[PDB]
Amino acid sequence: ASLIYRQLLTNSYSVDLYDEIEQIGSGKTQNVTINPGPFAQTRYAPVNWDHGEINDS
Amino acid sequence: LWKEMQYNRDIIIRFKFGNSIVKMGGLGYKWSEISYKAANYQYNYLRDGEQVTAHTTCSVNGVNNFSYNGGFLPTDFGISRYEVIKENSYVYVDYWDDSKAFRNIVYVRSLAANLNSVRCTGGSYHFSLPVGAWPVINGGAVSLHFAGVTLSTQFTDFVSLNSLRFRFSLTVDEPPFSILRTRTVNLYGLPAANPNNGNEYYEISGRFSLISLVPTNDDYQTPIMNSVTVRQDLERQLTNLREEFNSLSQEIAMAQLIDLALLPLDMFSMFSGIKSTIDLTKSMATSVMKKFRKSKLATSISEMTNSLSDAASSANDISTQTSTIGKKLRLKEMITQTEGMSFDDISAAVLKTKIDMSTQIGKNTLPDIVTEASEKFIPKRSYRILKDDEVMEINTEGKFFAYKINTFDEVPFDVNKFAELVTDSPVISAIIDFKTLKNLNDNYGITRTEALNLIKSNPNMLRNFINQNNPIIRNRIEQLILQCKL
């Protein structure tokens, strides 16, 4: 059971290796592509307000 | 020969995000990509009584790609892939300034900072709609929290500026990002539309430490403006550091080396305590292993085991067989744990006493040294097997003896009877080989107990004879130390 202390001290180099893991995995580019769901969006339209038809003569 | 110099400074880091936009065709309703882009920034600030000029560069990673697309109709609103930053995304801020510290940033022993967090909030973007109600991007915020400083470099137009890179984490904040006048509300996160909110600069303040390793060949005379950059540094010649390491054996001691050799040396015990830079203290151990794997000795281990496995299913005359099994015994010594004094113990002791009194100066070079010594140290060595008080001893050069334990007089050798026992009975490294042992017994007549101990290569008896100042053992171990010449 004392072997755990020896293993930790011996394998401590994996700490620096893990530091490299994380601090270059952050450097590497990742992009979680959140979707649009199966249900699709849509806006009304380009709508502009104006005065209606005028009865000229 | 390499002196620590602390350069800790309190700095103010000003930076701004970079925004790139690409329009999609039609009449001007859609958009193709809204994304973060690398952004430079210049400024000046007063600190410690002088105006220091600083140059920063912000970049983003881990970015999400939300979307929104009103359909294939040629006027319906949408943004095909509009980004945001949230939990996953990081932001780097490379920082540089004209102060003296950044000239001495080539070699570093340690480097870490303490910066105060900040809250970045998104601006208001009015998407360029030609007609109608005006869509409104607004809201969204994150918080930059510092996590870790590293080295980096701006590839600036005029030169490449060595610099410090600050990796800030993120934390989404209260204002729910929305696409108002549109179908996206109560998101959270900082989108790429207007990350700066019109602010001239986002600001951080903190203190960063640094321990540079400016060189020194004389105590009184320490430099400024480290200018031995890797343009000014070049590969030290292989034969040159071979000669240096060979010269280093001028000084090694006799008994202290054995005292060191009687330690269990592991990865941490050896490779710690090396006056090295940060970039090499990070992965020195793995660097050593990578070139240790491909060494001639290591591939010989691999060939031995693979040849035995293939054999498992395949089914001066004496000098050649003795030499081949001597190489095999050397391989077995390296792979297994022998209970003797184990020549590779002495090899590792010499290796540690050599490398401890050196320095890493921008190149690791423990690869090509550790792995090279592992194969070259003690070229001609000797092993022995005791049985029935008739110990058979073998030399890697091919020589062979077989002599009694109670009295050291040799006997005719028995090839193929030594080979049956060398496979299973434990091999004993012969650091006190037969010739020196015979000299010792003849001159300093020894007893049965210490005879057996020296045959077994017992550290207790070996150190007893060394501390007796026995000339025979002293000289023998001195030659042992002297073959360690790479």
Side-chain angles (χ1 to χ4, degrees), chain B residues 47-104:
Chain B
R47 169 259 285 165
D48 204 84
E50 67 285 37
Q51 172 153 280
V52 301
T53 70
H55 176 27
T56 45
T57 293
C58 178
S59 89
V60 165
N61 278 262
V63 74
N64 313 335
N65 301 52
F66 296 170
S67 296
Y68 166 45
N69 50 3
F72 287 120
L73 266 75
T75 50
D76 55 8
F77 192 91
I79 312 92
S80 66
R81 279 229 193 191
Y82 87 95
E83 302 183 344
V84 73
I85 46 166
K86 291 174 71 175
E87 313 304 342
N88 59 310
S89 307
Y90 304 87
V91 300
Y92 313 129
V93 186
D94 309 311
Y95 172 74
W96 184 96
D97 79 327
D98 61 350
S99 183
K100 278 281 166 218
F102 275 67
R103 287 301 331 279
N104 303 331

Side-chain angles (χ1 to χ4, degrees), chain A residues 16 26-27 30 32-34 42 47, chain B residues 62 64-65 70 81 92 132 282:
Chain A
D16 300 352
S26 69
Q30 289 81 239
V32 64
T33 297
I34 292 167
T42 185
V47 160
Chain B
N64 313 335
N65 301 52
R81 279 229 193 191
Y92 313 129
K282 198 65 151 287

Side-chain angles (χ1 to χ4, degrees), chain B residues 317-319 321-322 325 385-394 399-404 410-422:
Chain B
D317 52 327
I318 292 158
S319 71
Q321 293 88 19
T322 51
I325 67 180
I385 303 286
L386 65 94
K387 68 98 179 178
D388 303 337
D389 296 80
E390 327 189 343
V391 54
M392 280 145 284
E393 170 162 348
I394 192 181
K399 271 61 188 155
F400 49 93
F401 321 101
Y403 54 102
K404 257 73 162 187
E410 51 271 13
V411 190
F413 199 71
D414 45 337
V415 297
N416 306 86
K417 186 162 172 63
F418 170 71
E420 79 192 15
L421 276 169
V422 71

Side-chain angles (χ1 to χ4, degrees), chain B residues 175-198:
Chain B
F177 155 61
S178 177
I179 309 191
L180 186 144
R181 209 63 42 72
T182 300
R183 172 42 183 274
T184 304
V185 189
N186 276 104
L187 275 286
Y188 294 108
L190 191 83
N194 194 267
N196 313 267
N197 195 27

Side-chain angles (χ1 to χ4, degrees), chain A residues 9-10 12-13 16-17 19-20 22-23 26-36 41-43 46-48, chain B residues 29 61-66 68-70 81 88 92 131-133 167 181 183 266-268 281-283 285 289:
Chain A
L9 273 163
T10 290
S12 309
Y13 73 96
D16 300 352
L17 190 45
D19 300 339
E20 278 175 344
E22 72 90 22
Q23 74 94 13
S26 69
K28 184 63 154 60
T29 52
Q30 289 81 239
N31 310 294
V32 64
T33 297
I34 292 167
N35 216 10
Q41 300 87 38
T42 185
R43 186 175 180 275
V47 160
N48 198 345
Chain B
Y29 294 83
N61 278 262
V63 74
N64 313 335
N65 301 52
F66 296 170
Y68 166 45
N69 50 3
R81 279 229 193 191
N88 59 310
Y92 313 129
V131 65
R167 178 170 60 73
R181 209 63 42 72
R183 172 42 183 274
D266 50 33
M267 301 299 302
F268 171 71
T281 46
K282 198 65 151 287
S283 78
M289 289 188 201

